[PDB]
Design a protein around this ligand. Structure first.
Ligand SMILES: CNC(=O)Nc1cc(Br)cc(NC(=O)NS(=O)(=O)c2cc(C)c(CCOC)s2)n1
Ligand SMILES: CNC(=O)Nc1cc(Br)cc(NC(=O)NS(=O)(=O)c2cc(C)c(CCOC)s2)n1
Ligand SMILES: CNC(=O)Nc1cc(Br)cc(NC(=O)NS(=O)(=O)c2cc(C)c(CCOC)s2)n1
Ligand SMILES: CNC(=O)Nc1cc(Br)cc(NC(=O)NS(=O)(=O)c2cc(C)c(CCOC)s2)n1
Lengths: 318, 317, 317, 319
């Protein structure tokens, strides 16, 4: 039986007997994602180049902000693009807090690299006036999370309590079609993924781990290397093929480079629901209690056996 | 003034005063590229999943069919076919085309950027057409390029007049000229190769990569990027500058990438953009092929970066 | 504030505190409409004509399949099917749906506007579902409307809260709310019917049309428009006002259009927009059907125009 | 073997051994038509209604055609329904053709989503003088090419040239015009008449009688059907496809009719005649009228030959 994102979400909403607010939010987000995908694929560019005589990340942010505000399902919105949390006007306020990166990887969009949208959804915990504090929850508290990848095609990956599900956008009809159900990552993979150009600044644990991938002590084949440089693409490949992705801490960056709330947490949630792992080195990404909405975190994620092996080496250097 | 691929090609055709065969070919190819892009972005997938109750193969069929019916080709070499395809007599024209209809497609399950690569030669011999007609050095290319199915779809076309980049506007199905007479940076800040085969590197590669990470002159280290799909890695190289390498290893002692329909078209694009492309021993475009699916090592990109690699290569004899 | 069809329906569903079944139904239907629109605008036709080497049937398949799998329906009546379709037990929900999947399609060769028409009823009893569950008067409609595949694609949805119009944005595949709580003009300036059958007209129709062309009170004559596709004619009538007629004659004492899935949905839309719809003898919505494909005469549009028609009808007894 | 508009045109251009200027013009026009179709089907309308949160459709349609034709290097004079005077192309962009067009016909009624279209006629510049409005005042007989795009249930381009009439469907998935009907010919006689009968009180008696005969046939054959979309491209296209007759005739109030000769009546008459149909003013072939003003009107009756001839019989009876 064919299924779409909207029908899938409604169906799980009815099972759970909820009030429908999350379904309204997810539908609204989905509409924004389709609009971002259209702009990313350059629909209407002929008009920009004078066939008849706004920047992408800004527009992407405007689309998500506007669709979420008008969903009546949110109260606090945190974006990569905004210095402070956005507090939704009273008459539009609902019970969810949303942290997102509207167009991740967009630094490099000039070369037409895969880009994506990342989101994490929390329930507001207190009855106080909404504020930035409502977004400072650990990833464990996520109600739903995921990403849209604008790649060779556009795919939405949604993780919730029921698992991880992948939906392909059919641009002929503008629907997200469920194509991979309850997806689970390989126990162990054959690809490692990080920027080795910064090898001079690596922590010795990272240096050793990568050494073992290239020059395996035992009699096994070396791992392959892939690094797109766009987190959604690298993480999605990791989910699909297995393996490991690293944006670790060093001396220069003791808290890593990626953002905890709207990059590391949603991806860690997806990984964990898919039976993978995600660590900072010292603890599970999802257990970090944030104190700042734009705070950074080291991240190492992927197949469980690979992450465990990394942890073993990390401890040897602790 | 706005310009499109078809109008641009017609305009250059008139200036050269040709008979129009190459324009018919390029137009045909462009149509196939649009059809590939549509299928790659998964238009109509709902029908596959039962709303009413294979990609590399289709891509090949599209290019084959559009080129055959262009009346402009005689020999077609494809990554997908073991032998060259000889066009039936009534449809024969004067060009030979070597292509990879969907490069990077082994990894399409993860929605990595894929692309279409093509090189176009004039039939050189007066013999009945055969596989031999495709065994020309890259120097003989009349036109070459690629379509990248990335965050958006772009067609990059290199000819004698230079390199030009066209964005597909999917709202109207037209390729809009957005970057004219493109030139690569003299020197870049990114290197691109699969370092997972480090154990098999020849010592020249090992040293060159060491210098990118640990620069002797105390400049900043280069960034690393490797998509694992050649069209994407090469296009980034064109756009941001830097260097791309796929050298020989134990598994692939003649390099891994295919000379006719991967290495040559990209080398031609690079050279027309003021870049370089080498096997280590010689320019990629100077290799005389003996087999249509033969492999070649390749190092390409910004001139200063490729020349630096060659310095190190020479040091190791 | 922007609004879409799905968000609009959900928000009215929550207000009404329903279980969500109607929302699942409407969302499913909306998906089928987008797929029909895509096929009607001929997406993928290049593949039909050999680039790599039925419409009414597909439209029906799309609606049938999307409604069955919505878990919200038990009985489906279609212009295309001689008997009602009874949904298999595990997929059965509480609603009955009558539809014409592609109205006007006999003339689709000339690219005339076509459309999809639908009416939705709540099931009558707790008995085993059967054809009988679809034989309700139009007054019982819970929701009704149409998609017009015209110069653009629009969905018109009528419910208790009124009539709302949504434009399909094909760039993103979303129905955008563009006209809220629409109301028809009290009186218009266009009449619409097939005057080629003038020899068979009831004398009341003859006289009414005469008065439109030769107005007794010295006002301007009405314009005439007749597309020959009911969704297009009715939508113009909603938007510009006026009157649409497919009346009874000697040859067709029950008219030509179908009551369940053409006349009733359009009458419901009209009435919710403050218009009227009559057979001549009674309101279309008051006819109690005895056969699912039964025909009905219909005269609909602006209230003043329909009332004037009725005056003349009464004069002829 | 599959064929597209651009390939078809290039192929006929090579056969004729021309310099390619007409091909550049037709390709440019085709690009504008695809841009019009996209806008007509409302691509990007969510942005108008505040999804993140300009130009009217006939104005944009005109801008698209003007701009694409000017930059084709193939035109010198452009006449548009939208512009009071002819546009003379700047010297560096001048080519040998004159183009008369209606960029979005039927657009007055676009609020109800009726079919709309683009109509065009292409002439060779005849004189060697500086280009001017005069270059557009040629009889339809001098047309080199003409046709129309119908933005209907789907988008179709109909192209008439010396080689005949050919119909191309736009595949919006790839943005190509696919040849679907070759060398099309109209039926000898049809069963549909098409005009606005709301203005029956102002009809010429010839028209009144002709229509009477369609509804109440003297020889007791079946009556004709009536269809009137109110958008000329849609009514004319149905006439081409199903056969029959289309009328926008002259009356006492409008002795020269209502439709425009250069960019409505002529291109449609040329298409009809290349398809083996007819097009008359009543007094003469539409293509034989020598224009004296670029926006001048003309009465028009066109379609299947037998139907037009029958209309002319009745017209002659009323002197
Ligand atoms: C009692 N409800 C009822 O009678 N009808 C009805 C109809 C529709 Br249509 C939708 C819903 N409910 C929701 O949508 N609930 S929810 O938004 O809170 C939700 C979404 C998801 C996805 C959940 C499951 C995931 O939980 C983590 S919980 N209910
Ligand atoms: C003598 N011609 C004439 O009278 N009219 C006319 C009109 C049109 Br429209 C096109 C053309 N000619 C061509 O298109 N020639 S071509 O196919 O061979 C070609 C294409 C490209 C791109 C070339 C340059 C590439 O090599 C450097 S060469 N000619
Ligand atoms: C108790 N519900 C709850 O807690 N949450 C919740 C969330 C969502 Br999301 C949707 C809904 N319910 C519906 O959609 N109900 S409905 O399908 O029957 C309906 C649709 C329309 C439009 C109606 C109006 C009747 O039209 C005549 S009634 N409920
Ligand atoms: C001598 N040419 C040559 O060597 N190569 C070459 C290549 C291409 Br590609 C195109 C063309 N020529 C044209 O396109 N000529 S045209 O613009 O005037 C024309 C178009 C149409 C459609 C015609 C038929 C018009 O009938 C009225 S005439 N030539």
């Amino acid at each position: 039986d064919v299924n779409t994102l909207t029908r899938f979400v409604m169906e799980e909403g009815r099972k759970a007997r909820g009030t429908g607010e999350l379904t309204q939010l997810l539908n609204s987000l989905c509409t924004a994602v389709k609009a971002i995908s259209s702009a990313v694929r350059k629909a209407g560019i002929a008009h920009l180049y004078g066939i008849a005589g706004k920047k992408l990340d800004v527009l992407s942010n405007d689309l998500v902000m506007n669709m979420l505000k008008s969903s009546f399902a949110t109260c606090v919105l945190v974006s990569e693009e905004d210095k402070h949390a956005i507090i939704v006007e009273p008459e539009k306020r609902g019970k969810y807090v949303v942290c997102f990166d509207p167009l991740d990887g967009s630094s490099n969009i000039d070369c037409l690299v895969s880009v994506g949208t990342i989101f994490g959804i929390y329930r507001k915990k207190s009855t106080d006036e909404p504020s930035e504090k409502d977004a400072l929850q650990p990833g464990r508290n996520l109600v739903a999370a995921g990403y849209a990848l604008y790649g060779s095609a556009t795919m939405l990956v949604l993780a919730m309590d029921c698992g991880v599900n992948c939906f392909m956008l059919d641009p002929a009809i503008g629907e997200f079609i469920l194509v991979d159900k309850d997806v689970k990552i390989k126990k162990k993979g054959k690809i490692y993924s990080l920027n080795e150009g910064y090898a001079r600044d690596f922590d010795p644990a990272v240096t050793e781990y990568i050494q073992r991938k290239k020059f395996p002590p035992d009699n096994s084949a070396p791992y392959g290397a892939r690094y797109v440089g766009s987190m959604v693409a690298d993480v999605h490949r990791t989910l699909v093929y297995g393996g490991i992705f690293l944006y670790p801490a060093n001396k220069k960056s003791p808290n890593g480079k990626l953002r905890l709330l709207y990059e590391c947490n949603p991806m860690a949630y997806v990984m964990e629901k898919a039976g993978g792992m995600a660590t900072t080195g010292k603890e599970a990404v999802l257990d970090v209690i944030p104190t700042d909405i734009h705070q950074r975190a080291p991240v190492i994620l992927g197949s469980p056996d690979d992450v465990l092996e990394f942890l073993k080496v990390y401890e040897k250097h602790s």
